[PDB]
Structure formats: C-alpha cells, structure tokens
Specification:
This is part of a larger assembly, with chains A, B, C and D. Chain A is of the alpha/beta class. Chain A is built from 7 helices and 6 strands, in the order ββαααβαβαβαβα. Chain A is elongated, with a radius of gyration of 27 Å. Chain C has 4 helices and 6 strands, in the order αβαβαβββαβ. The N and C termini of chain C lie far apart (67 Å). Chain D has a 3-stranded antiparallel β-sheet with strand order 1-2-3, with no helix packed on it. The chains are: A alpha/beta, B mainly alpha, C alpha/beta, D alpha+beta. Chains in contact: A-C, C-D. At the A-C interface, helix 2 of A face loops of C. Chain A binds 3 RNA strands through helix 2, helix 3, helix 5 and helix 6.
RNA sequence: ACAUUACCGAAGCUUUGGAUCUUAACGAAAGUUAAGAUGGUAGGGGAGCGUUCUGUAAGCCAGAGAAGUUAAGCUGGAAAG
RNA sequence: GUAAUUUAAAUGUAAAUAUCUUUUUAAAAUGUUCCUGAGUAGGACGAGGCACGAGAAACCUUGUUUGAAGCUGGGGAGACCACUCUCCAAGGCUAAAUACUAGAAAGCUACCGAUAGAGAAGAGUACCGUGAGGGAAAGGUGAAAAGAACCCCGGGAGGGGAGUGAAAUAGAACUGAAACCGUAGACUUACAAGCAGUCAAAGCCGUAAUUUAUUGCGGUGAUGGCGUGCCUUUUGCAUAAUGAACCUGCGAGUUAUCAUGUCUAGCAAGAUUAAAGCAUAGAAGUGCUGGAGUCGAAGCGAAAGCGAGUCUUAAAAGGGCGAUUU
RNA sequence: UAAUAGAGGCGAUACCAGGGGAAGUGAACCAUCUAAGUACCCUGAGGAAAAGAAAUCAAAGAGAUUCCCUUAGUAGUGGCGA
C-alpha cells in the first residue's frame, strides 16, 4: 500500500510504500489474542506464597485426647480449619512464563501492524530525524505536533538511536520501540502510532522473511 | 490474589430479611430461622396459587346452591337445564349475579326450569 | 478501548465443583455417595478387586532385542520421484539436505511405495528386491554401501 | 520431567499394540501339563490372539507410552 | 341390590396469555409459523450472574461528597442489578 | 529524594606494575643394565556400593585367610577362554562452572493489610508444666492536643453549659452492622389447641386518587381453608436416627509434570526446539542465534531378518496383524 | 619440665564430606522388596565442599573433574508381585 509521509514539523514531505505482505495481511484476531495473553503472562513474577500446615510455626502435638473431652476431634493446632493454622490449597510459587510458536508470534505481529496501518489518521510516518541534543523539549514538541488522540503514543525506530530513546524515556504516554524488539500489547493499545521510514524499510525486510 | 471482600453474604441476608418482615418471634431477624421460614413460605405460595382456583370455584358453587334454596331446583338440575338450554354463563358470574341483582338470576332460573 | 475479541471456544471455563446445589456439582461434588472412591482413592495397580489381573494371567513372549537393533530410515520410491530428478546421487548427503531423513541415522533403506520414473544413481545401505527390480527396470544404478 | 508417568513393566511384557488400536497377546494354558490336552486345543492355544475390545481402554492406561 | 337422568370432584384434558428447546416449512439471513417436549436424585452435557487483582486505565466518575452498612421504590426468567 | 554524575583523611577488599622471591644457568640425539610404587594385583569365604535382590553376575570397595608378576609386564573390554583394540594402578595437590543465605545493601510483585501477614505491627513476652517443652490475645482521636479555661449537679466518676475544632451522637477515640437489651407511638390479644407460614378476609390506623367514601399503594390483623423445621444418612424418616445457643468473620478437587481425549490458534509429509549464547534495556524482558532430541512418514515376526507385505508353514493354501482410499 | 606453633567453643532450625542408620507406608495381609541412605544421631572443616588430570569410557574415536538439556522411563533388575 501507499502512504503519505509527513515532515517533522507536521507537514507533508514525501511518500512511502508499505509492503502488503506485512502491513496488509488479513487480520488474525486469534493470533493477536494469543500473543497478547502470552506477552502479559511472561511479565508475571509469580512469587506469591503461603504456608501449609507443615510450615506454620507450632508443635504437632494432639491438643487433647481423642475421646472423652467433649470437644471436636483434632490432630494438630495448625489444622487449616483452626484460626491461625495453615492454608489448604493456597497459592505456591509457580512459573507463569511460556513461549508461543514463532510462526504464531510472527503472524500476530503482521496482523497488529496491518490493523494499525488500516487507519490513515492514527498511523503516521515521519522522515528520519534525530534529537542530537538529547533534550526532552524537542521530542515532546515533535509528538505534540503529530499525535492527536490524547493518549498512548508509540514511536517506531529503525535502529537503536540512544539519543532519541533516552530523550523519550520520560514523556507522559510514550513508548519507544525498535523495529526488531516489538511488543504486541503496546502496538495493539497504541492510539497514536508514529513510525520512521527507516523503521518501515527495516520492518519490510524483517517480516517479509 | 486473596479475594475476600465480604459484601455478598450481608446482601443475601438483607434481601431475605426484607422479604420476611412481619414474621413472629425470632423468625424475622435471625438469618437461619428467617431463611427456613421464607423458603417453606414460597413453596406454600406456589401450592396455594394453584389451590386458590379450587377454593374460589367451591365458594361460587356454594353461593349458587344457597341462592337456589328458595325455589325447588336442586342446582345439579340447575346446571343440567343451563347446559341443555345452552346458556354458557359462568359460575363466578352467576354467583356475583345472585348478589348484585337477584331478580335477573331468578329470571334465569325460571327460564332454566323449562 | 479496543476489545481484544477472543475467538469463541478458545478457553473452556473450568469444572468448579462443590460450590452449591444449583451448579449440579454440589455437596458430593461428582464422587458419588461413599466407599473408597469418595475419599480420594482408588487402588491403582490395574486392580481387579483381587481377581488375578489380566497381565498376570497371561504369559510372556520373550526379549525385546533392543541394544542390538539395526535401526535406520525408510525412504520410498514415490518420495524420491516426488522430490528428485535425473543424474544426481541419491545418498545420505542429498537425502539429508533435501529433508527426506534426519542426520541422526545413516543406514537408509529404500522401499517401493509409489512409482519412480527418473534415472538416478543410488548409494544406500539396503534395498528391497521389488524396489531394486523396479529401479533397474527404469534404468538406474545401485551401489550398496 | 519431574513426574513422567511410569509404565507398568509387568504389563509391557505381556501386551502389544497393533497399528490401529487392537491389543495382541499370547494365550494361556500352554505352559504346563500338556499330555491330556487335545491336539487341536493345543494348536489353537499356540497361535496368538487379540483381546476383547473391553480391556483396551484400561490397557492404554497401563501402557502410557508403548 | 337392581334401573333412569345428573352433578360435584386432581397441577389430567380443553381454552386464554407468556418463555425456552427439538424437528419441519417459509425467509438472503435475522427470524416468523406448524408439529411436540420440557417431574427428576446419582450422574453427563451446555449456557450465565457475582467477588478480588492485572492490561485496557497518566481513561472516566468523587470533597459540589468515594467506598461501606442503611430506609424506601423499581427492573430482570434465576443467580441479581 | 529520584535520572545522569560524583565525597575517601583513615580502614577493608581487589587486580596491574615494578620491587622482592624462586627456578632453567643446555638441547636435539642409539643400544646394553638399574628402577618405575608389595602383603599390593589376584584367588577362597562372608557383606556393601554399582540401575543391577546369586542370577550366567562382570567390575569396584571391603572383613576373615591365602597369595603374584617386575615391559620378555600387568589391568580392562558385564561368566569365562583365545585373538585384537585401549590404558599403565597400589604417591600427593588443583581455581572456575556447581550446592547454600542464617543474614548485609540496593530493588521488584495480577504477594498480605490486623481471625490476614513471621508465633510476634507490642514477643517467644503474659501464662501452663519439676524439667525437657508448649504458647496466646491486644493496630486506627483530630489536619494540628489546639487534652474541654470557667460554671452547675455529684464524695468522685460522669453528665449538663460555656470554649477549642470543619465536626466533641470526633472527649482515649475513624466508618460502627448483625446477634442482644430498650424507650415512645399505632394496631391486635385474656373461650382458646397456629411447624407460626401461605391463600381469602371484616374492622382500625397511615397515605394517594376519584368532589369524598368508595377504589389502590401500606402497616396491623378477628375469622375461614391448606400445611409433619432443616441438614446428613437409609429399601423407607415429622420421626423418639444424626448435627447446630444465636450472630458475625475464618473455614475444602488447587499447583507442578506425564499419559490421553476434546476445543481454540498456527504450520504441514512434515511439525517443533530444550539447555544455552548474543544484542539492547536494567525492563526476573522478548527479538534473534542454537535441530542436539522427540513425535509422524511401514509394518510384520520371539528374534535373525524380510518388507506393502510379514509371520504361522513345503505351501499368497487358508487365515492372524497390516494397506491401495494417508 | 622448657620453647614457640595450630586447635577447644559458638554461629547457618543452610550447604558439603565421613561414620551410624530406622520406623509409619505401598505391595489393599506380610516375611523378600519398597519407602531409603529418608528423618535423625555423631565426627570434620570450607566459602563452597566433595571429587578432580584415565592401569578411563567403550566398539565410538575420543581424551581431568563437576553441574544442565537430551538419550529415557530407555537398557536391565524385581515373592518377574508392587
């Protein structure tokens, strides 16, 4: 597909081609759903824990005799029924991470990129620039010239431009991503998506393969 | 991930107590007795909703039989003549008629005796 | 707001059990009334309640002869026809790179499912009589390695 | 790998699986006193058989991998 | 006891209003009609309500009054809202 | 405080440089002799460890006994023998990768928020036992004490006023329910045998409409009809079978892996990486690298072995298990 | 007796090495076996320890020791019962 390219001051400068095999695949909402689930599960620490009968402090003496007292039978003081006792079938530390098939992950990336690029206004492309001073004023000015939907803004880069990345690490609702380190959740929930043409070309050969 | 917030049991109990307002003794405030009495009450309500039809029809029949005690028509024979002369009026209607306007009912009976 | 829109049937819920009468899985929770099974247990050992089990009534048959098998990959004439062409040497290297076998095994055998039409050269370890007859008839060459 | 299901070795040594479900086995009663048994009986006991379809599910539980 | 005409009498039958499901027909489909079929423990299958946290959410609603019990009223076929 | 930077007099821990210490102050090169680890190798009996329970039972350690060779050698190659291929014991050291965190510092959490969380937000204290030892319960005023000057009742406590405060039904305590105990008002009840409810229903009271005392929303209810609390367990329970003083909190099919079935997603005669590495980040990520391995693609036969056939057999002669239609 | 040198004990309700070594269970009994070198006891030090440079693996051509992924629930063993 064809796409207009705006200059860094908000005005049009040129035109670029978005390859169809990446930005115009038929959407696979199933792959998008699976990928989002996986990316957010892999982010869990999953270190919550709890003590069973055997880990609560206390003795394992029978509190009173089996028969004759007139009370309900009991084995140990830290019985899960008793107050302060252990916890039956509580949470234990566990590994929540898993790895999706790479083909499904790739298809999800293609689908989310196509879904975002389908809309002309929310997706935009800007000619290559850099913040040589590293300040934040300049970057913020560029976003606030482009972005319109008052919300999450995701910038895509074609390299690791450390100046831009550490100039944008502090913007309010900004996420800077390189082409080869994409995250489906950020792409899917981004209400403004601003890409460089370097990022466009690197994405083309990155996902055509 | 502890999921404790106990704004549920109080809700169940408040609805039950709201429906069990006028009951005698401890059945109006205690949760256990109120729930037992309410649940048997609702079952009674269903049964009785079906029974009210029988009760009212029995009342209507007795009222008709009373309004006919004057004349010499036993109301089995009255129903007889009613059907035979093809008057498809209703037990409720006849019972109410014998009270609101006795002379119309009496005329119906004269007409049945044929 | 973008509404992920999960595909239907992509995640069954669960069989949460013992959580009320109305759920159908109430007090007894799917276990029945009483007995051994109502309390966590079932005697596993293929058990028939003390009757001599089937795997103890029946007799045995012999060794497995593992540790001495000559195990090695099967390749069929139909596969060769579908994948190759004239003049090259069907052997370990070419079948491996063309993904007809895996390079764990190096003692291929050639079987005769499907038909082969192309004159080829073979460097294999075993060959069935029917397959080598058909292959000599089509006009190939066979070296046993 | 912490908890791989163990096969039941005494069952492995007696059962075998065919390609599409059936279970092959060796018949009993041909191991011991054999003079009295009729020749046709012995000949039938020699040849191997297949189990009834009622045991196949339990056997598939006993042999989780084979 | 034997005759004549009856009536009463169940959640049965019939009729009225409403809902779900199966089958069939119509309809592009949605659905609209016709037929019947829905007591139910064990137990099997299927469809939902509600609680807490997480992403959505640097969103929205709150000191001009959040959350929570608390009086009354109302809606949904049930969980309830 | 946080980002990126950055304080070291003194002390502690690290390398690098010399100093210092030590060593070679030489090697390529043929055959005769010497030595090359001795109660040791091995064997007999009794045991243990090797996955391997005497089994054909190697091999290693080892208790009781016995007992060698000296490179022209010896050990091992799962009884043993021969050949062959490897290795050279019976002397002594060795960092790293690996196990562990009582703790120290810097951080994180689909971890907890006072019956939770360490037993312990106050602690192994109070208390119990001769001792070993066992073992609790108790968090919250207000934004700030700005802790109610003074006055009245009372011995005080406490309350009523006056003041502080946005609030004093905020005054040693936030939000303050249920169980429980009350006060006041309305209605009903002392001729009656009510699982306390439901279906009808006069009268009284509250209230809205209809010009106004007859219809509804309501609370009480004379009287009539029906009705053996619930849970669990049994062929079968109101049963005089079992269980609960009430109320409020706490209080049970979970997690990790394997087998198998189904659903969803993806690829396809192929599918898929595990460990682990690199890069960026500091962001227990996720993008690559990594195909060793596993499951299909040919099965049959105890196996050798043969193969769309194989086995049973002289026999496809008939069948058993397959398939050509995955 | 003299001379110096190294140790005594505590700490880690952790880890490692050596010695001693059960019982509740499963096998629906039990006596083999299993649990299991598990708990625990005792002797030693370390920050890691132990082990560590082949009279070895093993029929492949490799080359110290240790820790992972696979091989693999495979090869064998087992009142061939578990």
């Amino acid at each position: 597909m064809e796409r207009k390219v705006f200059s860094k001051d908000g005005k049009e400068i040129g035109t670029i081609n978005l390859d169809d095999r990446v930005f115009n695949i038929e959407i696979s909402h199933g792959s998008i759903y699976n990928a989002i689930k996986n990316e957010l599960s892999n982010l869990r620490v999953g270190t919550s824990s709890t003590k069973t009968r055997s880990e609560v402090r206390g003795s394992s003496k029978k509190p009173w005799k089996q028969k004759g007292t007139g009370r309900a039978r009991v084995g140990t003081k830290r019985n899960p029924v008793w107050i302060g006792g252990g916890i039956a079938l509580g949470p234990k530390p566990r590994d929540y991470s898993y790895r999706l098939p790479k083909k499904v992950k790739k298809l999800a990336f293609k689908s989310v990129l196509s879904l975002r690029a389908a809309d002309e206004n929310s997706f935009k492309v800007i000619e290559n620039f850099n913040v040589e001073s590293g300040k934040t004023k300049d970057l913020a000015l560029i976003i606030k010239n482009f972005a319109s939907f008052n919300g999450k803004v995701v910038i895509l880069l074609g390299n690791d431009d450390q100046m831009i990345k550490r100039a944008g690490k502090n913007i309010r609702d900004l996420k800077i991503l390189s082409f080869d380190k994409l995250r489906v959740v950020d792409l899917f929930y981004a209400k403004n998506l601003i890409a460089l043409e370097s990022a466009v070309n690197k994405l083309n050969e990155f996902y055509i393969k | 991930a502890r999921a404790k917030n106990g704004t549920v049991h109080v809700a169940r109990r408040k609805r039950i107590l709201k429906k069990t307002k006028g009951f005698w003794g401890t059945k109006k405030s205690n949760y256990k007795k109120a729930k037992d009495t309410l649940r048997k009450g609702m079952m009674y309500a269903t049964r009785d909703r079906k029974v009210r039809k029988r009760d009212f029809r029995r009342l209507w029949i007795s009222r008709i039989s009373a309004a006919l005690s004057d004349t010499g028509v036993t109301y089995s024979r009255f129903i007889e003549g009613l059907l035979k002369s093809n008057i498809k009026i209703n037990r409720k209607i006849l019972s109410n008629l014998a009270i609101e306007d006795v002379e119309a009912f009496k005329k119906i009976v004269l007409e049945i005796r044929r | 707001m973008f509404n992920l829109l999960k595909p239907k049937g992509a995640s069954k819920r669960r069989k949460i059990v013992g959580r009320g009468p109305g759920s159908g899985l109430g007090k007894t929770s799917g276990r029945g009334q009483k007995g051994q099974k109502a309390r966590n247990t079932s005697p596993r050992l293929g058990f028939e309640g003390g009757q001599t089990p089937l795997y103890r009534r029946l007799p045995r048959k012999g060794f497995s002869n593992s540790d001495y098998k000559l195990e090695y990959a099967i390749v069929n004439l139909g596969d060769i026809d579908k994948k190759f062409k004239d003049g090259q040497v069907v052997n370990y290297d070419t079948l491996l790179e063309n993904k007809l076998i895996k390079k764990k095994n190096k003692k291929i055998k050639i079987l005769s499912n499907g038909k082969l039409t192309k004159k080829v050269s073979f460097e294999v370890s075993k060959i069935s009589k029917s397959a080598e007859s058909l292959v000599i008839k089509i006009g190939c060459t066979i070296q046993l390695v | 790998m912490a908890n791989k299901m163990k096969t039941r070795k005494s069952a492995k040594k007696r059962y075998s699986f065919t390609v599409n479900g059936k279970v092959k086995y060796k018949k009993q009663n041909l191991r011991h006193i054999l003079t009295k048994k009729s020749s046709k009986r012995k000949r039938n006991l020699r040849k191997s058989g297949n189990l009834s379809c009622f045991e196949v599910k339990r056997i598939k539980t006993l042999l989780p991998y084979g």
